[PDB]
Amino acid sequence: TSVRDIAKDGGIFKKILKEGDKWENPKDPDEVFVKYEARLEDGTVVSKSEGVEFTVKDGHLCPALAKAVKTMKKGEKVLLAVKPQYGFGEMGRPAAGGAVPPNASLVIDLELVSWKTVTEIGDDKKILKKVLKEXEGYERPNEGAVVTVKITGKLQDGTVFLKKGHDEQEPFEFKTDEEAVIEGLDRAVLNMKKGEVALVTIPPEYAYGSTESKQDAIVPPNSTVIYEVELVSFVKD
């Protein structure tokens, strides 16, 4: 059976119990959906989830999960043998939700169910585009394309402040790279395929900046905003 020293440390050994599908593994920015059960060597269950999502680079539970999933395929099911270095280290963890002793090793059953691919856009990497529905095939708006999109703009709490281009509205078309839209939407759309539906997280300097925007609700100055965007079609320049 396959067993990887994924940290190249003996720090984490991943043992494949069920092979996953395809060739793709998730990457740091992606949002993965996993289930797991994490135990001490004596079988004590310290944490468990029948399904939780996280951004790979932000981690979940302890360094070993994010390290592990970046090596896993869709549907892969594994048992991780984890040293305290990649677990809870010298501090261990107090009980509440399995206390983990200082310097304890863990044993973790982990299944990668699925994930959403997130692209970092801009020189900055500060614009995140998370694909909710893949578009069709290859080819993307270029600078000067005229694009038709449906968009909804929300604050990070869930407040919808903008809706444009939906089927019950007039169609919304813009030309890219003309400042026809906030810079984060302009750059996102150059990175999308026809039919793609994406969630775009956009910091203030690439959205409404330091002045309030009076929309369905006021976007407070300095807000990061999330656009859900569907690229309906485009005609490249």
Swiss-Prot record:
GO biological process: chaperone-mediated protein folding
Coiled-coil region: none
Domain PPIase FKBP-type: 29-116, 144-235
Gene Ontology terms: cellular component: cytoplasm
Alphabetical UniProt keywords: Calmodulin-binding, Isomerase, Repeat, Rotamase, Stress response, TPR repeat
Induction: By heat shock.
Molecular function GO labels: calmodulin binding; peptidyl-prolyl cis-trans isomerase activity
Functional description taken from the UniProt entry: PPIases accelerate the folding of proteins during protein synthesis.
Subunit structure comment from the entry: This PPIase probably binds calmodulin.
Protein name: 70 kDa peptidyl-prolyl isomerase
Source species of the chain: Triticum aestivum (Wheat)
Higher taxonomy: Eukaryota, Viridiplantae, Streptophyta, Embryophyta, Tracheophyta
Residues shown, of full length: 148 to 386 of 559
